[PDB]
Design a protein around this ligand. Structure first.
Ligand SMILES: O=C1CCc2c(-c3ccc(F)cc3F)cc(C3CCNCC3)cc2N1c1c(Cl)cccc1Cl
Length: 349
C-alpha cells in the first residue's frame, strides 16, 4: 500500500514525500535546516517533517538513527513529541538510505515565548504542569531526557506544550563551553560528571526552567562550568558529607571539598513576590543531592498544580526496551534494524 511520492527541492536538497503532504516549507537554518512545516491533507493537521540525511554514513550515525526512531515510535503522550508518520521513498532495504519523521507542528519553543520576560503565575503553572506530565510519562518508560531546556520545549499559540529531543543529547565539549544556554539547565552531577546520573537530572532542569518563567531571568547563567557550579552552590549550598560520598569521581569530590562551605539560601528572598507554593516546589526540585529531589509523579500532586492536577489523566508509558544501547553491531545491522522499524510503523488512530 505504498503511497505515491513526489520530489521537491528544499534547502538545497531533494525532499521526496507522499502526496498527502503538501505546502512543504523550510522552518529554519542550523539544526532547523532538515525540518519543514507542511499540511497533512489526510489528517488535516499542520505537521513538521524532519529528514535524516545519510543516516547510515557510519556505525555511530547508523545507531543514532536507530535510536531516534525507536524513541519517537515509543512516545504516545500529549506532552511528548511522537510520530504521526515515518517513511522512506525506498522500495527495498538495498535502496533504503533516507528517513523522514512526521510529527505535530507546534511552531515555537518556550524561548520565543518567554525570553527576557516574566510570565504570570497561572501561565507558569500550566507550562510546568505539562512539562511534568510528559516527564512523568517519559520517566515511567525508564527513559531519561537528559538535556531539557526551553529550546527543546515546543509550544503553540494556545501554550500547549510537547517535549522533544529526549534521550538524544550527545553534545560536544565545545558546545557546552562558556556562556551558553546549552549548559545552564544541566544538573551539576551531570555537568561535572560526579556520578552515574539518572532521571533525577531532568527534575533539576525543570526547576531551572520554572525559575526562569517566574523571574524572566536565567537561574544559573554561568560563564563556564566552574562559574556555573559556583552560582549553583551559592543558591543551594555546598555539598554535605552524605552527598560527598556519593560523588564517585575522586577528582570531582576533591575539587568540591576545596570550596568554602556555604549554606542554602532562603528561596523566599531569592524569588521575591512569587507564589509561596511555587517557591516550595522550587526548593524541592533544586536539591543538590539528586536522590532527594522530588520526582515528576510527586510534583504533579504538589498543591501548586491544584488547578490542573488530575490523577486519572496523567498516564504512564509502556516499558521501553533499550537493550540495543549496549549492543555493538555493524552499519548494515543497524540499518536493517532501522528499516524494520520504518516498515512496521502503525499510524496512530
Ligand atoms: O513544532 C515543532 C515540533 C517538531 C520539531 C522537531 C522534530 C522532532 C522530531 C521529529 F520526528 C520531527 C521534528 F520535526 C525538531 C525541532 C528542532 C528544535 C530543537 N533542535 C533540534 C531541531 C523543532 C520542531 N518544532 C518547531 C518548528 Cl517545526 C518550528 C519552530 C519551533 C519549533 Cl519547536
Amino acid at each position: 500500500e505504498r503511497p505515491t511520492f513526489y520530489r521537491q527541492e528544499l534547502n538545497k536538497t531533494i525532499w521526496e514525500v507522499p502526496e498527502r503532504y503538501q505546502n512543504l516549507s523550510p522552518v529554519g537554518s542550523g539544526a532547523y535546516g532538515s525540518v519543514c512545516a507542511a499540511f497533512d491533507t489526510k489528517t488535516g493537521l499542520r505537521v513538521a517533517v524532519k529528514k535524516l540525511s545519510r543516516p547510515f554514513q557510519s556505525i555511530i550515525h547508523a545507531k543514532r538513527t536507530y535510536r531516534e526512531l525507536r524513541l519517537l515510535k515509543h512516545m504516545k503522550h500529549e506532552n511528548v513529541i511522537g510520530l504521526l508518520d515515518v517513511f522512506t521513498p525506498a522500495r527495498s532495504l538495498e535502496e533504503f538510505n533516507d528517513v523522514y519523521l512526521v510529527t505535530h507542528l507546534m511552531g515555537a519553543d518556550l524561548n520565543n515565548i518567554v525570553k527576557c520576560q516574566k510570565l504570570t503565575d497561572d501561565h507558569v503553572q500550566f507550562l510546568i504542569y505539562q512539562i511534568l506530565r510528559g516527564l512523568k510519562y517519559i520517566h515511567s518508560a525508564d527513559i531519561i531526557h537528559r538535556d531539557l531546556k526551553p529550546s527543546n520545549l515546543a509550544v503553540n499559540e494556545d501554550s500547549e506544550l510537547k517535549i522533544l529531543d529526549f534521550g538524544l543529547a550527545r553534545h560536544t565539549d565545545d558546545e557546552m563551553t562558556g556562556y551558553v544556554a546549552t549548559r545552564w539547565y544541566r544538573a551539576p552531577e551531570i555537568m561535572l560528571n560526579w556520578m552515574h546520573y539518572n532521571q533525577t537530572v531532568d527534575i533539576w532542569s525543570v526547576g531551572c526552567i520554572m525559575a526562569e518563567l517566574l523571574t524572566g531571568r536565567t537561574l544559573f547563567p554561568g560563564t563556564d562550568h566552574i562559574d556555573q557550579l559556583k552560582l549553583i552552590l551559592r543558591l543551594v549550598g555546598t555539598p554535605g558529607a552524605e552527598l560527598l560520598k556519593k560523588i564517585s569521581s575522586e577528582s570531582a569530590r576533591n575539587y568540591i571539598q576545596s570550596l568554602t562551605q556555604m549554606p542554602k539560601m532562603n528561596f523566599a528572598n531569592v524569588f521575591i513576590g512569587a507564589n509561596p507554593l511555587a517557591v516550595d516546589l522550587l526548593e524541592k526540585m533544586l536539591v543538590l543531592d539528586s536522590d532527594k529531589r522530588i520526582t515528576a509523579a510527586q510534583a504533579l500532586a504538589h498543591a501548586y498544580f491544584a488547578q490542573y492536577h488530575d490523577p486519572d489523566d496523567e498516564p504512564v508509558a509502556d516499558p521501553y526496551d533499550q537493550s540495543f544501547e549496549s549492543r555493538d553491531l555493524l552499519i548494515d545491522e543497524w540499518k536493517s534494524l532501522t528499516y524494520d522499524e520504518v516498515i512496521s510503523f502503525v499510524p496512530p488512530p
